[PDB]
């Protein structure tokens, strides 16, 4: 319920696992931002309303293991500068929205073991974060991803910038100018070529 833990303004630790939670209302942690550890593992959570973790400010390590989450909205997590560790292992997450990791400064510890990650352009920010923050070798071996159309033998950390080269970055002013000018320039070139051919044929005939 909203304001479920009201009166515990100085709470620091909060653990809720093996409870089978299935629905958490938005703004249910009003005044609970003081906590630093939050365990919501071993539940049946599927969707998180945006702004649920917004009142939390001093939270450091967050766990969401063993849940039914499919899409993790960046608005739900928000910006938590004091966060240090986050866990999403044993879930049903397929891809992460770009820029979600860039909202918060410190994401030193991350666990993504067992998620059905479908490697793709979307996962490229996560792969870049792996390049910046290398995982432990055992965790790198355990965490894998699904390659559509064939075997899932490709490790998540084995990808490099060559895979990122396929992704189309937002176009700059040069590409915008070129795609704006391709049409009229091509039409003028065609008109000039036809006019030159006609003038040359007229000159040859008049000779």
């Amino acid at each position: 319920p909203p304001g479920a833990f009201a009166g515990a303004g100085a709470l620091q630790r909060l653990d809720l696992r093996e409870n089978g939670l299935h629905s958490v209302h938005v703004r249910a942690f009003w005044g609970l931002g003081a906590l630093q550890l939050l365990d919501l593992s071993a539940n049946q959570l599927e969707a998180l309303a945006p702004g649920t973790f917004a009142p939390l400010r001093a939270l450091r390590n967050l766990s969401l293991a063993g849940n039914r989450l499919a899409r993790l909205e960046p608005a739900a997590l928000g910006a938590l500068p004091l966060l240090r560790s986050l866990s999403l292992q044993d879930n049903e997450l397929a891809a992460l929205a770009p820029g979600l990791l860039g909202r918060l400064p410190a994401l030193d510890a991350l666990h993504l073991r067992g998620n059905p990650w479908g490697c793709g352009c979307a996962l490229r920010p996560l792969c870049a974060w792996l390049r910046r923050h290398p995982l432990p070798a055992s965790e790198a071996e355990t965490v894998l991803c699904v390659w559509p159309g064939r075997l899932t033998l490709s490790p998540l950390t084995a990808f490099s910038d060559a895979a990122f080269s396929h992704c189309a970055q937002p176009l700059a002013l040069r590409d915008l100018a070129v795609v704006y000018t391709l049409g009229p320039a091509s039409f003028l070139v065609s008109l000039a070529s036809c006019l030159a051919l006609g003038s040359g044929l007229t000159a040859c005939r008049a000779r």
Binding site: A122, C167, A168, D175, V179, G183, C194, G198
Partner: protein, 271 residues
């Protein structure tokens, strides 16, 4: 490393590549109006004239290439609307590129042989060239592909009856009129189905394309046929806002066109 993803939608670039051709060159023509040429104009006029052999074979060629482009669009309609591909790897895109550069050369040859440039610029053939040819150049430059307005080449089916006339297949006026009516109806049916399919599978733009409905092209053809006969089963219908607006406009236009074409139908029935 090999992967395909939609990423960010780039339809606006393809659409602008035709808008900043059409409207900008129309403004250029208007401003020029406010502010050996005869020989080359006569040469281009006799080049595309229907009397000579060159004009006949050339209009037959452009009709055949329009048929080929329509077949290519029919094949490619079974794919995601926006997708990345390699121009060198696939040669169907090369075939479409050759077809479209031939269309561009024909458009230039027509534009030279034009007494009035402004009224030539508002023809249906000119506007289908504008909304077909720059998109393939933009696609091959950006190494991506968008389905776009490539069904509009079906509007070149209207000349089909003329294609018969100078091949000694149609002589009487009644058969020519019947074939013209059938070709016009088929072409407008196909292009209306094309717009409906594009606007339904693309989704609403202001709602982040979350209203996309998995409708094939032939399902949209079936929907248009059911609608135009005033049956309306309701098994398939447009769910997007823009799709519903297009359906309303198509209903009004089809009713008006049928009411206008009733006397020709009566004349074909005769006494």
């Amino acid at each position: 490393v090999p992967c395909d993803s939609r990423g960010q939608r780039m339809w606006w670039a393809f659409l602008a590549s035709s808008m900043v051709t059409f409207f900008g060159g129309l403004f250029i023509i208007l401003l020029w109006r406010t502010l050996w040429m005869t020989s080359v104009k006569d040469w281009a006029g006799v080049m595309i004239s229907a009397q000579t052999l060159t004009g006949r074979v050339l209009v037959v060629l452009v009709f055949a290439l329009s048929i080929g482009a329509l077949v290519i669009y029919f094949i490619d309609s079974s794919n995601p609307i926006e997708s990345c591909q390699n121009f060198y790897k696939d040669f169907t895109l090369q075939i479409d590129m050759a077809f479209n550069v031939f269309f561009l050369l024909y458009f230039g040859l027509r534009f030279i042989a034009a007494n009035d440039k402004l009224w030539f610029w508002l023809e249906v053939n000119s506007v289908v060239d504008f909304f077909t040819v720059p998109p393939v150049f933009v696609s091959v430059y950006l190494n991506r592909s968008w389905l776009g307005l490539r069904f509009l080449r079906a509007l070149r089916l209207i000349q089909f009856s003329e294609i018969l006339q100078f091949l000694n297949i149609l002589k009487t006026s009644n058969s020519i009129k019947l074939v013209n009516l059938l070709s016009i109806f088929i072409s407008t049916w196909l292009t209306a189905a094309g717009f409906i399919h594009l606007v339904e599978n693309s989704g609403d733009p202001w709602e982040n394309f979350q209203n996309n409905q998995a409708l094939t092209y032939w399902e949209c053809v079936y929907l248009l046929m059911v609608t135009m006969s005033t049956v309306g089963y309701g098994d398939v219908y447009a769910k997007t806002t823009l799709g519903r607006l297009f359906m309303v406009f198509f209903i009004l236009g089809g009713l008006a066109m049928f009411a206008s074409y009733v006397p020709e139908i009566i004349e074909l029935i005769g006494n």
